[PDB]
Amino acid sequence: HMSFSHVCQVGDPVLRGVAAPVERAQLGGPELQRLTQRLVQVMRRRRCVGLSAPQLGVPRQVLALELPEALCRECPPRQRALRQMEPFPLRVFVNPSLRVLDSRLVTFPEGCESVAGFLACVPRFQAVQISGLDPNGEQVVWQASGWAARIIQHEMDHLQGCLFIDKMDSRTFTNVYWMKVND
Amino acid sequence: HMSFSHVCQVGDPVLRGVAAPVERAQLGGPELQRLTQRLVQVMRRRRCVGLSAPQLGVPRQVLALELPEALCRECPPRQRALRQMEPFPLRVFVNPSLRVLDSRLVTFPEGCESVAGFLACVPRFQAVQISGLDPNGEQVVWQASGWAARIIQHEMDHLQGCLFIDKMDSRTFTNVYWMKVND
Amino acid sequence: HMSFSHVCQVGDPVLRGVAAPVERAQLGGPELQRLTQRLVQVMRRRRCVGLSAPQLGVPRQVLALELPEALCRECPPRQRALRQMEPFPLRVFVNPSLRVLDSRLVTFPEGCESVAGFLACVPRFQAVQISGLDPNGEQVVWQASGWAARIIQHEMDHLQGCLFIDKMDSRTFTNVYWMKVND
Amino acid sequence: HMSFSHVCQVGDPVLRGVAAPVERAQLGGPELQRLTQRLVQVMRRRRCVGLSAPQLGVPRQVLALELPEALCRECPPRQRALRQMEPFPLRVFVNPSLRVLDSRLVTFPEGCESVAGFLACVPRFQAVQISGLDPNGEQVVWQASGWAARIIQHEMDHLQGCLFIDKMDSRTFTNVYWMKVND
Numbered sequence: 001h002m003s004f005s006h007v008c009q010v011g012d013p014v015l016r017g018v019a020a021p022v023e024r025a026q027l028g029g030p031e032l033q034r035l036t037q038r039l040v041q042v043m044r045r046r047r048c049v050g051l052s053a054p055q056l057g058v059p060r061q062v063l064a065l066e067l068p069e070a071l072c073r074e075c076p077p078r079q080r081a082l083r084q085m086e087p088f089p090l091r092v093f094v095n096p097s098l099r100v101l102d103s104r105l106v107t108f109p110e111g112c113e114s115v116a117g118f119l120a121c122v123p124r125f126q127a128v129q130i131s132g133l134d135p136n137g138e139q140v141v142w143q144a145s146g147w148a149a150r151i152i153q154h155e156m157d158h159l160q161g162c163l164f165i166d167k168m169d170s171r172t173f174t175n176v177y178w179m180k181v182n183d
Numbered sequence: 184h185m186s187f188s189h190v191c192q193v194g195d196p197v198l199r200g201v202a203a204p205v206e207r208a209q210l211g212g213p214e215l216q217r218l219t220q221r222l223v224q225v226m227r228r229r230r231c232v233g234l235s236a237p238q239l240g241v242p243r244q245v246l247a248l249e250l251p252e253a254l255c256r257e258c259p260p261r262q263r264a265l266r267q268m269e270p271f272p273l274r275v276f277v278n279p280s281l282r283v284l285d286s287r288l289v290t291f292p293e294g295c296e297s298v299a300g301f302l303a304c305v306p307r308f309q310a311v312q313i314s315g316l317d318p319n320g321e322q323v324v325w326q327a328s329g330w331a332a333r334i335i336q337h338e339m340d341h342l343q344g345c346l347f348i349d350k351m352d353s354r355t356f357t358n359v360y361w362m363k364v365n366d
Numbered sequence: 367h368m369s370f371s372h373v374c375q376v377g378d379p380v381l382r383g384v385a386a387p388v389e390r391a392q393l394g395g396p397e398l399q400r401l402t403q404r405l406v407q408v409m410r411r412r413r414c415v416g417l418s419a420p421q422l423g424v425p426r427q428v429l430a431l432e433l434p435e436a437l438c439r440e441c442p443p444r445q446r447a448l449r450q451m452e453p454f455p456l457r458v459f460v461n462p463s464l465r466v467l468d469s470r471l472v473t474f475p476e477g478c479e480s481v482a483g484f485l486a487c488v489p490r491f492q493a494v495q496i497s498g499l500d501p502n503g504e505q506v507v508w509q510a511s512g513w514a515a516r517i518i519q520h521e522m523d524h525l526q527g528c529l530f531i532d533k534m535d536s537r538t539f540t541n542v543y544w545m546k547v548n549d
Numbered sequence: 550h551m552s553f554s555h556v557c558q559v560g561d562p563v564l565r566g567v568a569a570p571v572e573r574a575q576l577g578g579p580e581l582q583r584l585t586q587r588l589v590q591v592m593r594r595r596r597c598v599g600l601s602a603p604q605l606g607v608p609r610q611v612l613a614l615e616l617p618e619a620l621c622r623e624c625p626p627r628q629r630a631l632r633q634m635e636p637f638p639l640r641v642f643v644n645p646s647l648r649v650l651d652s653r654l655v656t657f658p659e660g661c662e663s664v665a666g667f668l669a670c671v672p673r674f675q676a677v678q679i680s681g682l683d684p685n686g687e688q689v690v691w692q693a694s695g696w697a698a699r700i701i702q703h704e705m706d707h708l709q710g711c712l713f714i715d716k717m718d719s720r721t722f723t724n725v726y727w728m729k730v731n732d
């Protein structure tokens with residue numbers, strides 16, 4: 001008995017609210033386990049590298065992040081090196097907080113599963129750390145730079161009701177079927 | 184005798200360039216007449232109230248504006264009065280320039296045929312003057328306020344390579360299939 | 367007060383289910399009244415001529431139809447005549463059934479708010495009868511031809527889990543930003 | 550130096566035409582080289598596994614196909630095995646013809662870069678041979694089964710003016726942001 005899930009699209013107010021914290025008594029519980037399993041499953045089906053609970057319609061501070069080596073390798077080596085893209089294992093964070101460690105800004109195109117079909121360049125900090133709980137309830141601080149830091153920031157912004165269209169260079173917004181190419 | 188026309192979508196660089204003037208050699212000529220006729224035809228087919236030549240792929244300073252009574256009438260009356268939405272006849276402007284007459288800002292939702300399917304709230308000046316040539320080279324000046332002034336501003340921005348997403352309140356950006364309703 | 371509503375998009379399984387009937391006990395009731403008020407409000411905000419409860423996420427046999435004169439005059443006279451498009455007052459039907467009175471097929475482009483942004487040609491019967499209850503349980507039978515018969519058939523198909531892409535000439539499917547025009 | 554390329558979307562009549570053959574005089578030439586390099590670049594940028602000239606607005610019988618290992622490994626092993634998905638190198642075909650080698654039908658979801666953002670299940674033959682010329686005019690033949698045969702048939706359809714929506718199971722058409730998941 002399979003089921004349907006959908007990623008909410010811009011216009012749904014759940015993407016602009018401030019997600020609520022998960023309560024201690026829910027940690028390690030069945031309901032949070034179903035939510036984390038669904039987030040990871042959607043994230044992986046869509047081949048995206050992060051997803052947050054509000055995008056599945058659940059206004060709670062939960063997000064998952066993963067970048068498999070196959071996806072880094074899909075990126076041409078020069079572009080991979082420019083973006084400082086390196087793989088990293090799946091991590092799920094509950095009630096996370098972000099601390100900026102290197103505030104230099106780096107700008108590259110990104111897109112969001114909740115604004116399907118578009119990209120724009122967005123400046124992001126070079127390095128950050130995210131601290132929060134696992135769904136079992138243990139604390140972890142994960143520090144990263146480059147593309148991983150960009151993913152952490154994009155996903156953290158979703159828990160504050162922020163989407164990348166709020167931070168983009170709007171003259172670079174584009175449907176994914178238009179692209180710049182080498183002559 | 185039928186052909187296809189298309190409204191360019193965001194990503195096409197024609198929408199971000201600064202449109203070149205129409206050379207005087209072209210005024211009153213067949214090529215300019217085919218372009219103005221096509222802009223008016225597509226504007227009326229799409230039931231929209233302004234269109235510019237870069238949106239049909241032509242990087243030239245030409246735009247058309249029209250608000251038929253039936254479109255105003257489709258607006259509920261209290262919204263129509265708040266927006267100061269009143270009908271006006273077709274005008275076509277070639278090499279137009281804009282001056283602000285009343286710089287008070289008014290915010291309402293707008294959409295654009297070149298960012299199909301979305302709306303966002305955009306501040307606009309209350310009143311403006313657009314001056315330019317009709318397709319035959321005669322001077323035309325139109326001072327407008329309220330919703331007519333907002334239409335003029337949106338079309339004139341297209342000839343500078345500016346889309347409403349560059350000026351919007353991005354937290355109000357929405358797919359048109361999401362909307363606020365009265366309970 | 368203010369709330370959000372959305373029209374479900376294709377992929378949502380609610381659009382492919384067969385809506386359940388409203389039980390006799392519910393006719394004239396406050397829950398049905400909430401649904402019918404919401405359906406008509408969304409229909410009027412989107413300026414669409416018909417809407418069904420599955421498109422608001424509610425798998426119940428309830429639809430609304432309305433074609434105001436202004437909306438109707440937005441179509442040029444020659445096209446309204448070809449399409450037999452005439453205004454008609456609001457009807458809300460509960461548990462409707464359809465009978466075909468004239469099975470001649472008529473084909474014109476149609477779109478659906480649950481497949482936002484596309485049109486395609488769809489053959490429809492020239493005249494039908496819809497019979498059902500008004501939200502109060504009164505029996506209402508409406509015989510319609512031409513464009514109103516097409517709206518009726520499109521909304522009734524929603525209650526059976528059928529969308530217009532199931533019945534279209536697929537070689538005429540188009541984004542709305544492409545159109546055939548007269549030279 | 551850089552320019553912009555776009556994948557034409559449904560509605561553009563170039564996608565429904567039957568593409569003209571490449572004339573013998575053009576084989577090996579610079580214009581055909583520019584077209585093939587552009588196809589391969591867009592195909593690689595978009596991480597898709599085939600692309601045809603009509604989709605870059607050029608109504609000529611040219612297509613390219615490529616499934617790199619990394620892109621292949623984005624798909625989980627169980628799903629790869631089910632779909633008979635394996636990597637294969639770049640091939641570019643000019644004036645190709647298709648012969649069916651195993652007419653057994655296999656049904657899975659596919660999407661098209663010219664119908665951005667949707668998928669639907671389409672039955673396809675289990676094995677085919679494509680034969681045609683390379684850009685230098687040498688005979689190229691490739692016998693393929695499973696997922697590779699699907700991609701061949703999808704690209705060949707584009708040179709006949711056929712899109713997947715003409716062959717799909719329409720009840721399975723879905724926005725990519727709706728998906729079936731495991732409980």
Ligand SMILES: CCCCC[C@H](CC(=O)NO)C(=O)N[C@H](C(=O)N1CCC[C@H]1CO)C(C)C
Pocket residue numbers: 047048049050051052055108109110111112113114119150151154155158
């Ligand atoms: C990069 C920062 C955003 C990471 C997370 C998003 C997915 C998402 O919206 N999470 O909320 C994603 O994977 N986006 C991808 C993305 O932005 N990419 C994928 C490769 C490169 C970059 C576009 O430049 C695709 C799915 C649009």
Ligand SMILES: CCCCC[C@H](CC(=O)NO)C(=O)N[C@H](C(=O)N1CCC[C@H]1CO)C(C)C
Pocket residue numbers: 230231232233234235238291292293294295296297302333334337338341
């Ligand atoms: C109002 C300022 C924009 C006027 C021009 C646009 C058409 C366009 O993009 N021209 O470039 C339009 O008619 N847009 C309409 C529009 O913005 N409307 C219709 C009335 C209300 C407002 C949406 O709030 C619809 C078609 C999206």
Ligand SMILES: CCCCC[C@H](CC(=O)NO)C(=O)N[C@H](C(=O)N1CCC[C@H]1CO)C(C)C
Pocket residue numbers: 413414415416417418421475476477478479480485516517520521524
């Ligand atoms: C004609 C049969 C479909 C009518 C009802 C639909 C809206 C809807 O999906 N109902 O479920 C509608 O108004 N569609 C309009 C529609 O198809 N129109 C407007 C009149 C002309 C035709 C576009 O050719 C627009 C919103 C797409």
Ligand SMILES: CCCCC[C@H](CC(=O)NO)C(=O)N[C@H](C(=O)N1CCC[C@H]1CO)C(C)C
Pocket residue numbers: 596597598599600601604657658659660661662663668699700703704707
């Ligand atoms: C499989 C048959 C179509 C192959 C070629 C297309 C791209 C295209 O339109 N070529 O004309 C594609 O790669 N489509 C992908 C595709 O259909 N996929 C990618 C992974 C599996 C399958 C989705 O079920 C995405 C990009 C939609």
Ligand SMILES: [Co+2]
Pocket residue numbers: 111112113114154158
């Ligand atoms: Co996102």
Ligand SMILES: [Co+2]
Pocket residue numbers: 294295296297337341
């Ligand atoms: Co516009």
Ligand SMILES: [Co+2]
Pocket residue numbers: 477478479480520524
């Ligand atoms: Co519909």
Ligand SMILES: [Co+2]
Pocket residue numbers: 660661662663703707
């Ligand atoms: Co395709």
